[PDB]
Amino acid sequence: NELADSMISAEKVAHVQLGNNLEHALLVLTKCGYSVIPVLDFEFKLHGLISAAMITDAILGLRIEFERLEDLKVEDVMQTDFPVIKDFNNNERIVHLLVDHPFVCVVDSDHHFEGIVTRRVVLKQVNRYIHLQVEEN
Amino acid sequence: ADSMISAEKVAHVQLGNNLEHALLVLTKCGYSVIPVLDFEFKLHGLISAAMITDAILGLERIEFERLEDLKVEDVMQTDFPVIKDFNNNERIVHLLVDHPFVCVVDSDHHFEGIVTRRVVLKQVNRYI
Ligand SMILES: [Cl-]
């Protein structure tokens, strides 16, 4: 159960809500310690992922138009194309997703946001394996 | 060893550049953290949008007008691990447990590239 036990619980992951403006999202991103955060609805279902780069790209003028952050909404710029994990029954699919994704969101069958799995657990396992090889030799 | 992303494929900023320029480079480049170099391409620090925005967080507002007043060296992180070569492979994997990437430099602090967690994930996927 090592992949499942490594999930970071949702209440430890900052998020924004549909309808939040981009100035609010930038504040959450800056304080939270994650470079990408989930976008949830009022039922805590997962709709998207947002980063500072997505926000700033949206206000790149012909001048960075920081005044526009007040008016744009997170759903206007968030990424809607993302993988999810719905169970821990398949270790290989999770490891496969972590190749091109630094973390993957965990949701239940109705898309309620549960937490994230990151690459760190796999690095911990590789680290342990390397040390076991030293021990065995 | 063969997985290092070489320095010329990584965007950087230079000492003395302001935070407005750094935000532009960060936004376009596709890396969330980029190196800060000097004229000799020596590594002085690492900078991210979160470091930049934290520096201009007021008690009432995000003070974007201050981006042109601050320089990258004012906000960059200067305490980070590096590797000089691939003569200590166990240390590299050890570092990648708590760091998403580590910079590669030479003895003169010249920036050579970065090693990331992705290559390890690639190997694990292939073994599995
Ligand atoms: Cl990572």
Residue numbers in the entry:
A (entry chain A): 12 to 73, 75 to 149
B (entry chain B): 15 to 142
Give sentences copied directly from the paper behind this entry.
The facultative intracellular pathogen Listeria monocytogenes, like many related Firmicutes, uses the nucleotide second messenger cyclic di-AMP (c-di-AMP) to adapt to changes in nutrient availability, osmotic stress, and the presence of cell wall-acting antibiotics. cbpB encodes a 150-amino-acid protein that is conserved in some Firmicutes. We determined the structures of free CbpB and CbpB in complex with c-di-AMP at 1.6- and 2.4-Å resolution, respectively. These structures reveal that CbpB has tandem CBS domains (CBS1 and CBS2) that interact to form a disk-like head-to-head homodimer. However, here we found that CbpB is a direct activator of RelA and that c-di-AMP inhibits CbpB-dependent RelA activation.
The structure of free CbpB is similar to the c-di-AMP complex, with root mean square (RMS) distance of 0.86 Å between their equivalent Cα atoms. The major differences between the two structures are within the c-di-AMP binding site. Notably, the conformation of the Tyr45 side chain in free CbpB has severe clashes with the bound position of c-di-AMP, and therefore the binding site does not exist in free CbpB. While these structural differences exist, they do not provide obvious explanations for how CbpB-RelA interactions might be regulated. The CbpB structure exhibits very little change upon c-di-AMP binding and appears as a homodimer in both the free and nucleotide-bound forms, similar to the crystal structure of the CbpB homolog from B. subtilis, DarB (PDB1YAV). It remains unclear how such modest structural changes result in such large impacts on protein-protein interactions, and future work should compare these structural characteristics with those of a CbpB-RelA complex. The third category maps to the conserved surface of CbpB, which is far away from the c-di-AMP binding site and could be involved in another function. Although this analysis is not conclusive, it suggests that this region could be important for the interaction with RelA.
